[PDB]
Amino acid sequence: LFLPQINEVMMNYWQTLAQRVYNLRHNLSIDGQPLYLP
């Protein structure tokens, strides 16, 4: 009997939220491309 896989995409939600937010706190915009905003 063989064990199931980890189901990325649903985790992909977590790590993509962590990514977005990290990019907000560090002022990095939507990609890592940095921004200098007014």
Add this chain to the structure above:
Amino acid sequence: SMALSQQNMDIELSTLSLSNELLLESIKTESKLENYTKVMEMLSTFRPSGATPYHDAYENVREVIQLQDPAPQGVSALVGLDYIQSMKETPTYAQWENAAGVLTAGLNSQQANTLHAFLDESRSAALSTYYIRQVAKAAAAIKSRDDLY
């Protein structure tokens, strides 16, 4: 009987070897030999009417020779037989086994590959053909080597 060990799912075997194992086992199934080396030694030793008469270890040692244009111990194994002088010494396939094996154990990795190449190919040819003429059950029409595949 196959094992689902990860080892079986990763390490990349040259095929035409896995097959060769299949054929050695299918051969040993009949006549109940004491080891595979008795199947290649024995069957490959004297088996007339086809290329099957060819011996395996003779191919493994002649492949060492293939390795060089022309420890002294191994030289006492190859001089232990007599291909170019004294006809054929007729050493037993045992002394062939130690001779060829010793001669390879001191041989390079890439040339070890190509010797698995030629060795495995020819050994596949003989084991195939012999599996055709005998050990192939007459119930399945078998005939050509492809229909064996």
Add this chain to the structure above:
Amino acid sequence: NNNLAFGAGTDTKTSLQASVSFADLKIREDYPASLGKIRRIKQISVTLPALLGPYQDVQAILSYGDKAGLANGCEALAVSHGMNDSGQFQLDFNDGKFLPFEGIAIDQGTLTLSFPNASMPEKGKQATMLKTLNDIILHIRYTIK
């Protein structure tokens, strides 16, 4: 806004990013005023005089750090060739397609340029050349409308 810093992004802790405010290029004063009040970039090319040896290509990109327009306000220009180049393979005007940065008012905004894999202590492919490169030349073409 003019600093030369290392990058804070997840990827690009090593990438060295060198950012230039436009408001300090005072491009509005390289002509009279009243000749054209709206002044807007046609494109930007980058020259990285340096010894990049055969066979090696510089790696860098040009963000833009503020809100203008174009595509999501995000258009990189990936500097590779290193000599007087743009992110386009075969560059041509009148193509039908906007060139990256076309439309940026030449006052507002911030222009940053990032060499990836710069920092030497954590081994980096561009550390050497980036030691060798003298300075950055940017060729701006801005049509005065």
Add this chain to the structure above:
Amino acid sequence: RDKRALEVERTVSLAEVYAGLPKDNGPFSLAQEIDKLVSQGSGSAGSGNNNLAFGAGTDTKTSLQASVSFADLKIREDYPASLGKIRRIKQISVTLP
């Protein structure tokens, strides 16, 4: 769904590729190796996917074929990630100095 996709151009030399291989894959000088192979009848260098071998096709027993895995060009690491996850060849040119 179509955004302007930033173009990168990256030279790669095969000498460096084959030399840079880990020992298990049998890294090798390209010049010496090639000259050996043409000098003799056959032989190869290199790992299974990076090797430089002679061809096994009916035509091309003589044709010398030198094969480079991409996974060892590590092109994904010549830029940050997250800059673009999909990275796709525009074309390939070859220079044979």
Add this chain to the structure above:
Amino acid sequence: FLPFEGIAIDQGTLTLSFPNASMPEKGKQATMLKTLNDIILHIRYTIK
């Protein structure tokens, strides 16, 4: 499309074949292939 346009830059394998190389069986390119130093490949891969 240009040839190879669309290849992901990880997966795959890239091979390059000089015909008529091997000298023992006489071959038009044996000589030059002795002389050629090494191969340079210029890849242009658009990051989307």
